[PDB]
Write a protein that binds this ligand. Structure first.
Ligand SMILES: *[C@@H]1O[C@H](CO)[C@@H](O[C@@H]2O[C@H](CO)[C@@H](O[C@@H]3O[C@H](CO[C@H]4O[C@H](CO[C@H]5O[C@H](CO)[C@@H](O)[C@H](O)[C@@H]5O[C@H]5O[C@H](CO)[C@@H](O)[C@H](O)[C@@H]5O)[C@@H](O)[C@H](O[C@H]5O[C@H](CO)[C@@H](O)[C@H](O)[C@@H]5O)[C@@H]4O)[C@@H](O)[C@H](O[C@H]4O[C@H](CO)[C@@H](O)[C@H](O)[C@@H]4O[C@H]4O[C@H](CO)[C@@H](O)[C@H](O)[C@@H]4O[C@H]4O[C@H](CO)[C@@H](O)[C@H](O)[C@@H]4O)[C@@H]3O)[C@H](O)[C@H]2NC(C)=O)[C@H](O)[C@H]1NC(C)=O
Ligand SMILES: *[C@@H]1O[C@H](CO)[C@@H](O[C@@H]2O[C@H](CO)[C@@H](O[C@@H]3O[C@H](CO[C@H]4O[C@H](CO[C@H]5O[C@H](CO)[C@@H](O)[C@H](O)[C@@H]5O)[C@@H](O)[C@H](O[C@H]5O[C@H](CO)[C@@H](O)[C@H](O)[C@@H]5O)[C@@H]4O)[C@@H](O)[C@H](O[C@H]4O[C@H](CO)[C@@H](O)[C@H](O)[C@@H]4O)[C@@H]3O)[C@H](O)[C@H]2NC(C)=O)[C@H](O)[C@H]1NC(C)=O
Lengths: 234, 207, 165
């Protein structure tokens, strides 16, 4: 029933303004019982509070907005009471701002409060989306075949190197979907140079070597790369 | 910055009961969260002691002095998750702990398998040299990688990466060593060490 | 900065009236210097004096008789209670409490005018003491008056806890 839906650019560029929008369904943002906001989580790091608001006011204000002191300087929180939308604007972004941003529904000592409302817990969460901040431009992957042994344990392993490229992802298939059993592909590596890099690996018998060769099938949509390479040992 | 003090990891076997701590909460606006790897967090407790809808009675809240405590009694497969604690602070600000990483035991100890690869003929043409160590099929998912040149250890060009779970329930990772073709041809042999629960597994390549 | 006297009920979330006068009645136990307390208790929306506080009494010598205080300057009294009624039937938002607001210095500057006028009616040698009410009825200890048509009582004390000269 109540569902929070995150939306926006999954790949913002460095020093630009990050923007995300939540689509509330199953609750009214107009309702006085809770606050609405966000909670971010860096790749393999803790949950960080971002901030929250609610238009439900008192005699001295026209609503309430609460910010994380450090993120205050670079953020704007917004509420579209009738369109049932929540907004986040985060200006001048660094790779330090790369996180899975979650749309949060805050509960606590909200509805009937003394002096001010105390929202303290994220009662209803969203699926969350990963934003990737980068100070790097698109580059094609350098394809190099990785030759195995000539003369381990009956069946040996060979792979294909997917060097320096940006952005993610990449798809490598062996002999255009000819082999499924004894097939493997390794994940990417974020380079110190802001670039990306990965590889794949396949295990095949020694008797097949000779007139029968192996070719990996590389695919990259942004830089427009689809170059395949044959593998031969020495 | 400011964070609640939660132990980094914790373990129990199925049937057993685990009790994980959280320090820094002077009030009662204390909350606990459940995080499944490759998923979003789900609240399991609020106002110290209170459970939300359709959350089992085995999940419990406690708070003595400045320390809050969650208790998972009668552990099961679906309990293996990351547990965070949270509390209100100062006026209206909100904090989270570091999160405790829970592990449900009873998964056979598995040994890794390395597949190191020296550079290619086409790669050296562009004045480059990169060696890739391919570690796979290990349990638990916590491995350390070290690189060497003949006998002496290497500290430059290391780009080790976080492990990942495979289709066969095991974990896998890869460390990427990028150097110059000059230092590759002078030093004959190149060793790659991978340490798994005390015991290490070695591989080596020389042209 | 300002004083806040605690109140108990409702129903007007406005009032914002002015203080015109005050009801005083002293008790037994003279010792060396006279002490006075309030006893109704305060007047609102009446008739203020021309220049400076005008004070008279039924019997100045008798302790049992009421003493009249007619101020020159109107002392602002802003009163409120939790207003939000939009959601039936329970109230929502700030619960605070029922309270009446006055400015710290504004009352003290009006109180010193009474103090100086209280010296001359007893041949100077001023040592004016303001203490809590004797009792009798719950309307005497808690200021029972009218504002916005209705009659409601609430404690002061904070207003009469000073000794002058
Ligand atoms: C009858 O008479 C009564 C008097 O007798 C009278 O009562 C008065 O009522 C008025 C309202 O009607 C009251 O005024 C309001 O007070 C609010 C709360 O004030 C307290 O808190 C603030 C903030 O305190 C924290 O933050 C600062 C800065 O970081 C620190 O310095 C503090 O130490 C404290 O820090 C903790 O919390 C932080 C956040 O959680 C943490 O980061 C931190 O680590 C700490 O844990 C203080 O500034 C106040 O202090 C002042 O007063 C004391 C009094 O003793 C002085 O000694 C002192 O010098 C100060 O002057 C106080 O302690 C105010 O928030 C509120 O102001 C806001 O609203 C107006 C609206 O017009 C805005 O213009 C203004 O900018 C403020 O907006 C911010 O806050 C609101 C929420 O309040 C947000 O929604 C808004 O988005 C904005 O937030 C942004 O900034 C926040 C920080 O402020 C930040 O947290 C957010 O993240 C965000 O980015 C207003 O002034 C008044 O206090 C009453 N007085 C009394 C005595 O009762 C009554 O009305 C009368 N009756 C009637 C019916 O009329
Ligand atoms: C006292 O307590 C009450 C709560 O009982 C509290 O009221 C809230 O106050 C805030 C602040 O003003 C209100 O928020 C405003 O909403 C404006 C739009 O209002 C209309 O739409 C609301 C939501 O849409 C309905 O329809 C959509 C359809 O698509 C649906 O999804 C929604 O779920 C929802 O059903 C709706 O709730 C609202 O209804 C109220 O008013 C009607 C009469 O008009 C009344 O019959 C209802 O009972 C109800 O009270 C209405 O139809 C919005 O424009 C506004 O402003 C924004 O923009 C300006 C730009 O300058 C900013 O100034 C402002 O900060 C906003 O950004 C504002 O957000 C909220 O809806 C109140 N209502 C409720 C029920 O919570 C009071 O504030 C408290 N305080 C006091 C003392 O009054």
């Amino acid at each position: 029933q109540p569902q929070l839906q995150e939306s926006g650019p999954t790949l913002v560029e460095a020093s630009e303004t990050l923007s995300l929008t939540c689509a509330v369904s199953g609750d009214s943002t107009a309702a006085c019982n809770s606050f609405w906001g966000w909670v971010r989580q860096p790749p393999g790091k803790g949950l960080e509070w971002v901030g929250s608001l609610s238009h439900c006011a008192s005699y001295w204000n026209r609503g309430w907005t609460y910010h994380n002191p450090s993120l205050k300087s670079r953020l704007t929180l917004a509420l579209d009471t009738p369109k049932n939308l929540v907004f986040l604007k985060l200006n001048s972004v660094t790779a330090a701002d790369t996180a899975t941003y979650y749309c949060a529904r805050f509960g606590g000592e909200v509805l009937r409060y003394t002096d001010w409302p105390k929202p303290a817990w994220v009662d209803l969460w969203g699926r969350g989306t990963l934003v990737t901040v980068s100070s790097a431009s698109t580059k094609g992957p350098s394809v190099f075949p990785l030759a195995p042994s000539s003369k381990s344990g009956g069946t040996a392993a060979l792979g294909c190197l997917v060097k320096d490229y940006f952005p993610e992802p990449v798809t490598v298939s062996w002999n255009s979907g000819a082999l499924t059993s004894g097939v493997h592909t390794f994940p990417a590596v974020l380079q110190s140079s802001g670039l990306y890099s990965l590889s794949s690996v396949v295990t095949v018998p020694s008797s097949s070597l000779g007139t029968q060769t192996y070719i990996c099938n590389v695919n990259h949509k942004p830089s427009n790369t689809k170059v395949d390479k044959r593998v031969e040992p020495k | 910055q400011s964070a609640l003090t939660q132990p980094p990891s914790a373990s129990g076997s199925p049937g057993q009961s685990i009790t994980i701590s959280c320090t820094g909460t002077s009030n009662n606006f204390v909350s606990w969260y459940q995080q499944h790897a490759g998923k979003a967090p789900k609240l399991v407790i609020y106002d110290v002691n209170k459970r939300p809808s359709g959350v089992p009675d085995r999940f419990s809240g406690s708070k003595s002095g400045n320390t809050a405590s969650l208790t998972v009694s009668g552990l099961q497969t679906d309990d293996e998750a990351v547990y965070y604690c949270g509390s209100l602070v100062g006026n209206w600000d909100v904090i989270f702990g570091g999160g405790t990483k829970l592990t449900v035991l009873g998964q056979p100890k598995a040994a890794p398998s390395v597949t190191l690869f020296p550079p290619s003929s086409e790669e050296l043409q562009a004045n480059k040299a990169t060696l890739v160590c391919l570690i796979s099929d290990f349990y638990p998912g916590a491995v350390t990688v070290a690189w060497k040149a003949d006998s002496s250890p290497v500290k430059a060009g290391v780009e080790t990466t976080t492990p990942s779970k495979q289709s066969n329930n095991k974990y896998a990772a890869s460390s990427y060593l990028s150097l110059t073709p000059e230092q590759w041809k002078s030093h004959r042999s190149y060793s790659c060490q991978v340490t798994h629960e005390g015991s290490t597994v070695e591989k080596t390549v020389a042209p | 900065d300002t004083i806040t006297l605690p109140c108990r009920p409702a129903p007007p979330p406005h009032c914002s009236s002015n203080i015109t006068g005050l009801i005083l009645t002293r008790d037994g136990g003279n010792s060396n210097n006279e002490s006075e307390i309030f006893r109704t208790q305060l007047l609102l929306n009446g008739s203020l004096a021309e220049e400076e506080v005008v004070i008279r009494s039924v019997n100045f010598t008798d302790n049992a008789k009421s003493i009249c205080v007619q101020l020159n300057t109107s002392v602002e009294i802003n009163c409120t209670r939790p207003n939000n009624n939009t959601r039936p039937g329970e109230i929502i938002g700030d619960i605070r409490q029922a309270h009446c607001n006055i400015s710290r210095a504004k009352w003290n500057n009006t109180l010193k005018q009474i103090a100086s006028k209280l010296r001359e009616q007893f041949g100077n040698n001023k040592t004016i003491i303001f203490k809590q009410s004797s009792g009798g009825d719950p309307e005497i200890v808690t200021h029972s008056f009218n504002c916005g048509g209705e009659f409601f009582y609430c404690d002061s004390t904070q207003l009469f806890n000073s000794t002058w000269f």
